[PDB]
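Lecture 7, part B: from sequences to assemblies.

Below are the input chains for today's worked example.
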Amino acid sequence: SVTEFLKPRLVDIEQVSSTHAKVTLEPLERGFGHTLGNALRRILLSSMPGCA
Amino acid sequence: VTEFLKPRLVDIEQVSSTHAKVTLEPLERGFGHTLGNALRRILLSSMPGCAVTEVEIDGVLHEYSTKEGVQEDILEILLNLKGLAVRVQGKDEVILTLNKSGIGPVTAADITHDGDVEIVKPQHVICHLTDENASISMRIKVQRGRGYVPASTRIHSEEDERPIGRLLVDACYSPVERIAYNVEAARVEQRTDLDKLVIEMETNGTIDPEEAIRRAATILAEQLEAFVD
Amino acid sequence: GPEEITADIPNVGEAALSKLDESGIVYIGAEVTGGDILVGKVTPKGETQLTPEEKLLRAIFGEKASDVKDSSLRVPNGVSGTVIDVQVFTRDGVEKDKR
Amino acid sequence: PGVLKIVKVYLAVKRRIQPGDKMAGRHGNKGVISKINPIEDMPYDENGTP
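Predicted structure of the full complex, as structure tokens:
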């Protein structure tokens, strides 16, 4: 993996209700979990298309 | 997509041989800086680079000493050679042999230069000896690594081996170690405003800026693939 | 009998002797991991009678006789690393000078 | 007289920092090493200097 490590396998997501949920990921690489989480947050916030 | 305006890497100017300034086409904000940061992380993280793995020097066998004509210590010579940089062929674990004698200045030319090994600074200092009778001759195995490792990390792997004479050291194995991700809003006139990104890579010369960038991006995409699941 | 460093530690692992130089001491610059034994002094131990059981033990294994208590120098706990050099001082009247 | 000979063996040990170290400064200021993250976590400068 040339430091490719691996990808979080376990992707269990716990949804308390239809309006609130929590998701957990398996082991991602050092900094990889954090960098990916920040990137996904910035994307899903800075870009979330829909109708309203 | 909705007029995604997919960018493209362009105007890739190699500022140096171990550095480059590569731009790309405009893209929507809120991710471009994030894309650059993620790319810098992945390339910095999964940085497979050719480094020095094991060493063997005739005069200096075990740990730390001084020999007539010698200048820098065993670890000091270790750093001095580490002062030079190594780029390997597709097969790693190459073995270099630095052997020389005389009174001239120390340069990287006087090493075992083969097809699987590239030497950049042929003016790297190796603590030129002061005695004509002194004759440096050290054979070192150089491997490609992806990340840093303790020197004690490889203790169990060679219990009987790595005896007095055989040398092993810690490493960082970060091919780039210098890359900044700057996002600037530019290069979008016809469509919606988008950010033009310029990447200033600075590596050790083991990998090309474009190839390493592509590798890091592929790794990032592969990781994002798991996010679907 | 004095504790002489000759790596002749009774009931000593082969690797333990594999590091000590013939002088009981070890080679120089050699690195020690864990509690490695460096200089094996042979402190004399007490003797016994015929002890036909111990006579048979000597006839089988032998070479120990419970006569040399092991005064070997082994590395301290939590101590492991490179031995830069060593120093040996012998009193007047003793000049083995192995190393 | 007790020892007909004496042998001193010298071993030298290297040392890198570890978690919880003791930083010092002639400005009196004292510091205890807390944590080191990936250089990604360090904020980037204008020149990108983390």
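Note for the exam: The helical segments of chain A are 32-46. Keep this in mind when comparing with the next example.
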